[PDB]
Design a protein around this ligand. Sequence first.
Ligand code: GDP
Ligand code: MG
Length: 160
Amino acid sequence: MTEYKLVVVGAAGVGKSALTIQLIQNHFVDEYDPTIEDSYRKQVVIDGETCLLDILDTAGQYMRTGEGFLCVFAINNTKSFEDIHHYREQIKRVKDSEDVPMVLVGNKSDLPSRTVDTKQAQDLARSYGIPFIETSAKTRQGVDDAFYTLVREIRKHKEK
Ligand SMILES: Nc1nc2c(ncn2[C@@H]2O[C@H](COP(=O)(O)OP(=O)(O)O)[C@@H](O)[C@H]2O)c(=O)[nH]1
Ligand SMILES: [Mg+2]
């Protein structure tokens, strides 16, 4: 199997842990300690390649060595969306590159209180040249898609 090192970043409270816990446990957590920053492993077949996803769920070596970044905001949190820029500047600085495998994730899609429309998120991901994927860690909508798509963005950038 092949290792892929993934890093989930974004403002406090957006769903990094919930996304990460969904992917691995297939369940939704209401209350995950917002300070717990830790690495999780998951073995999964993605397009016939057995993959070991090594995932840092940041709380706020992986930044330097992480091969791909899920930049998460919550769609019912405008501030978190506006914050994306800073998470991106951080990763560009660390990698000394504008071409970092990256997906922009708009989480909490299940929630009715939408303050960031898909067109805004699409405008942002287009400026950056990255995919935008909408998720809900609660229903699991898009969660596999965000993580797989990040894997695929990593393969697009380098041989794995
Ligand atoms: N309804 C809903 N609540 C969510 C979702 N993701 C996270 N939450 C809630 O938002 C709070 C913060 O989640 P935790 O994100 O994982 O925050 P982070 O790890 O600091 O980004 C918790 O109460 C979660 O249950 C989601 O997709 N839908
Ligand atoms: Mg957390």
